[PDB]
């Protein structure tokens, strides 16, 4: 029934504090109410401390807040092997102590930031140690994969080609939200050149609320977590769909809010609104899980979608007749009291697997090579319990992820 969550890496923790905020906010549980149902991991104390100093301070147990005073290191190796190792046990312990206390759970919603040290590496083995300790569950990892041109870390790809290959054979469904492609939404669909990280977080903090929160919440067309991976992954590769939200209108500027279904659903497939720089440049969808929430008439949907199924310029895979999982919830969304999110009475958090990422992965793989081609910051990992193996052998890994996402599509 439940779904634990492990927010790993400063980012996964910032986003965590955010997604965790939106929660109580739409459940009437102020600062000090019940008890969360997740954990927080980081090898840099000062960040988890922000959850220990700032807002939502006492809504957590100093037990579900793991820290390694030591060093973060923007390098996979160190975070996965060398350092990150020391903490893992302890980490697990909570996701085994928190996993027990419950009643027939469904899985762990993992929150990490692909291209980091504590986020890429660590998790790599966290999800790793999970796939074995609970192979019998769902492993949906919600990632924030590398901005297409606006990356931060100098190494980023090293850290992301490595978190992909190690987690690939362990996740159930990996959701993806592109940090940059979300900015566009903040520039083009909300207008603000002042987007603090605290915003992107409010956003995913939204799209995510549509996943677990409301879905695990009764409705006219419930959709379990398992449901996802089933209706969402055509193949064992921990396939990565993309998150998209519909009423991303500004709560100040424009106001046409009352945008009946027929509109908000069409607003999902236009590439300029998908929290991912993977513009459907060719990527044929192969399965979409249209999660609606608020006042929505099933016919409105079983029509708004019909209209789409016949737009053709939206070309769905061949081997897939119908790939539209319509998830209907009741309670409308719940916008921050005064952030910058419109606040409509219905939304569409549609996520999907698109042959599109054939790109995004490509463009991120290429990156890697360029540097590896010169070993660049390699000495930083080797000296951290890794080898020419793990790199070269994780490169070959993704290689067959560029062929995979190619074969499962583009061909009939």
């Amino acid at each position: 029934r439940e779904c634990i969550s492990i927010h790993v890496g400063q980012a996964g923790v910032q986003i965590g504090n955010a997604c965790w905020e939106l929660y109580c906010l739409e459940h009437g549980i102020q600062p000090d109410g019940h008890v969360p149902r997740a954990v927080f991991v980081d090898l840099e104390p000062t960040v988890i401390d922000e959850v220990r100093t700032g807002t939502y301070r006492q809504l957590f147990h100093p037990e579900q807040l793991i820290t390694g005073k030591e060093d973060a290191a923007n390098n996979y190796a160190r975070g996965h092997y060398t350092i990150g190792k020391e903490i893992i046990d302890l980490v697990l312990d909570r996701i085994r102590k928190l996993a027990d206390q419950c009643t027939g759970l469904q899985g762990f919603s993992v929150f990490h930031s692909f291209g980091g040290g504590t986020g890429s590496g660590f998790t790599s083995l966290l999800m790793e140690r999970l796939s074995v300790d609970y192979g019998k569950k769902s492993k949906l990892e919600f990632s924030i994969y590398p901005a297409p041109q606006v990356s931060t870390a100098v190494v980023e790809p090293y850290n992301s080609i490595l978190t992909t290959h190690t987690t690939l054979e362990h996740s159930d469904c990996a959701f993806m939200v592109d940090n940059e492609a979300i900015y566009d939404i903040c520039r083009r669909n909300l207008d603000i050149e002042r987007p603090t990280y605290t915003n992107l977080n409010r956003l995913i903090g939204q799209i995510v609320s549509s996943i677990t929160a409301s879905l695990r919440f009764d409705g006219a067309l419930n959709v379990d977590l398992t449901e996802f991976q089933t209706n969402l992954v055509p193949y064992p590769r921990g396939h990565f769909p993309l998150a998209t939200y519909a009423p991303v209108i500004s709560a100040e500027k424009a106001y046409h809010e009352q945008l009946s279904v027929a509109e908000i659903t069409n607003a999902c497939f236009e590439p300029a609104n998908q929290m991912v720089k993977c513009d459907p440049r060719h990527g044929k969808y192969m399965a979409c899980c249209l999660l609606y929430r608020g006042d929505v008439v099933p016919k409105d949907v079983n029509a708004a979608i019909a209209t789409i199924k016949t737009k053709r310029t939206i070309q769905f895979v061949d081997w897939c007749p119908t790939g539209f999982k319509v998830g209907i919830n009741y309670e409308p969304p719940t916008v921050v009291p005064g952030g910058d999110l419109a606040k409509v009475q219905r939304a569409v958090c549609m996520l999907s697997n698109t042959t599109a990422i054939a790109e995004a992965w490509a463009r991120l793989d290429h990156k890697f090579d360029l540097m590896y081609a010169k070993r660049a910051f390699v000495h930083w990992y080797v000296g951290e319990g890794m080898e020419e193996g793990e790199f070269s052998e994780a490169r070959e890994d993704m290689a067959a992820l560029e062929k995979d996402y190619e074969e499962v599509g583009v061909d009939s």
């Binding site: 009764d218 419930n222 398992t226 449901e227 055509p234 079983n302 790939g323 539209f324």
Partner: protein, 426 residues
């Protein structure tokens, strides 16, 4: 006689709320209250759907099967939601995944025994059992898979009592799901081989019939459901009323199924006029047959005009002349000799109750067994292949312990089912 409704899945469930919303009023049963019945006749036959415990608490004898709590917890937390004895709620807090395979082999298969348990507690209620009513949608997990199992088990436990099935076959134009043909083809398969009376409804055949035959501009689901539930009341419950010429599930079955497949029908209600204005009262009778027998007004998607009929059952329920009834039916059978199949001298099965739908003067449920429904399983079957060919979202099935030969099976079966049905259109 008796029957025991079955609310499989969410849809089948959502509808339960509407089928019982209605039926009750058509039997004067308030939430937990008793029989306030404006009359005294809406009681001598209730048993068919309730049970005597207190003396004011006649509880609906149905089953609520679903792997998604929130649903039944919306039906149980709203209006009439507090009339079902909790024992009726056979939930599966598991992940009600939208996979036919997840609610038929892996997740549902567990919750089954805890269902059959009750389906027996209700069957062994009292008097004599007739059959079970089954509501669900062939486009999801808890619906097509788990509900299609519930029957395969029911039909092994009492291959004597009947099995009416109310299926919400995947509407054409737009599919309210993606694998739809997967969850569907797989459930129709189970249907063609267990239940022996199926009434296929189409969310969009309804809209139409609900937005143009009822100037209704905002047809919420509640409505569609409501309209449907209107037909299933005319069918069953109705005939369990007096009549110059009354029938009952069997008559309906033994007059409508020429060949064992089970065959699926297409229900149609009679007075379907918009509120205020339209209240034309042109309901002498030629007006009802006018209605019922037109293309639009067939809850099905397909249009009768696109294929002969094998059988028809105008189950009227309102004082009328066994002459103006028996007569009309004829001209109708001659004006359209074209489509009405010939090797059956009298396709039509005239049925006639007495008391009408509570507030109306004269109505007549239509249960057509036309060969037209060929052009629907075709549809479904097509969608399958076009996507099966590429094994589209197949990993969500197999990965749930399924078979690559299972899908083959169903399609073929249900695909052959299309074939046969044509054997009569000719």
């Amino acid at each position: 006689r008796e029957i025991v409704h079955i609310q499989a899945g969410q849809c089948g469930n959502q509808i339960g709320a509407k089928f019982w919303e209605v039926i009750s009023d058509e039997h004067g049963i308030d939430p937990t209250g008793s029989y306030h019945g404006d009359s005294d006749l809406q009681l001598e036959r209730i048993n068919v759907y309730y049970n005597e415990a207190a003396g004011n608490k006649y509880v609906p004898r149905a089953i609520l099967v679903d792997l998604e709590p929130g649903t039944m917890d919306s039906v149980r937390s709203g209006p009439f939601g507090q009339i079902f004895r909790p024992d009726n709620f056979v939930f599966g807090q598991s992940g009600a995944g939208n996979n036919w395979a997840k609610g038929h082999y892996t997740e549902g298969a567990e919750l089954v025994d805890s269902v059959l348990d009750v389906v027996r507690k209700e069957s062994e209620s009292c008097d004599c059992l007739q059959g079970f009513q089954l509501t669900h949608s062939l486009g999801g997990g808890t619906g097509s898979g788990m509900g299609t199992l519930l029957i395969s088990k029911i039909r092994e436990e009492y291959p004597d009592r009947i099995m009416n099935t109310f299926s919400v076959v995947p509407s054409p134009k737009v599919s309210d799901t993606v694998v739809e043909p997967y969850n569907a083809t797989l459930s129709v398969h189970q249907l063609v081989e267990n239940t022996d009376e199926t009434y296929c409804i189409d969310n969009e055949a309804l809209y139409d019939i609900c937005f143009r035959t009822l100037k209704l501009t905002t047809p919420t689901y509640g409505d569609l459901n409501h309209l449907v539930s209107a037909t299933m009341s005319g069918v069953t419950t109705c005939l369990r009323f007096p009549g110059q010429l009354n029938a009952d599930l069997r008559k309906l079955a033994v007059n409508m199924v020429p060949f064992p497949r089970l065959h699926f029908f297409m229900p149609g209600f009679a007075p379907l006029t918009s509120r205020g204005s339209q209240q034309y009262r042109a309901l002498t009778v030629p007006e009802l047959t006018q209605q019922m027998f037109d293309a639009k007004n067939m809850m099905a998607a397909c249009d009768p005009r696109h294929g002969r009929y094998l059988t028809v059952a105008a189950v009227f329920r309102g004082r009328m002349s066994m002459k103006e009834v028996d007569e009309q039916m004829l001209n109708v059978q001659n004006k359209n000799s074209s489509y009405f199949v010939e090797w059956i001298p009298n396709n039509v099965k005239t049925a006639v109750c007495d008391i009408p739908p509570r507030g109306l003067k004269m109505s007549a449920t239509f249960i057509g067994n036309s060969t037209a429904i060929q052009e629907l399983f075709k549809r479904i079957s097509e969608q399958f292949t076009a996507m099966f060919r590429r094994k589209a979202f197949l990993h969500w099935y197999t990965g749930e312990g399924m078979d690559e030969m299972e899908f083959t099976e169903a399609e073929s079966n249900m695909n052959d089912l299309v074939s046969e049905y044509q054997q009569y259109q000719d």
